[PDB]
Amino acid sequence: VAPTLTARLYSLLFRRTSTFALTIVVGALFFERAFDQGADAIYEHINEGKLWKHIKHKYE
């Protein structure tokens, strides 16, 4: 399962510079988002100095 992983990854997606590119662009899409979630979620957890301020001052 492990060797065949990197292998299959090469087989189906890496040879043809086509797919190789098709994947990195498609892989950049999902990544950009998942990185911005975790990253912001991290920025929040170490803080909580703004935003939950909203639940207080407004709500109308």
Partner: protein, 48 residues
């Protein structure tokens, strides 16, 4: 004096996280190509 204060530090976090991934990655790319020169062996075979 610095309204941007917080925004940059968020990017800064991303900048460290990103570079903490790109840096080793580029290193290994550069390591892989220099492979050929790092392990090259020489031999000198003059006549006689």
């Amino acid at each position: 004096a610095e309204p941007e204060h917080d925004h940059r530090k968020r990017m800064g976090l991303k900048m460290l996280l990103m570079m903490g991934l790109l840096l080793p990655l580029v290193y290994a790319m550069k390591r892989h190509k220099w492979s050929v020169l790092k392990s090259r062996k020489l031999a000198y075979r003059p006549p006689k």
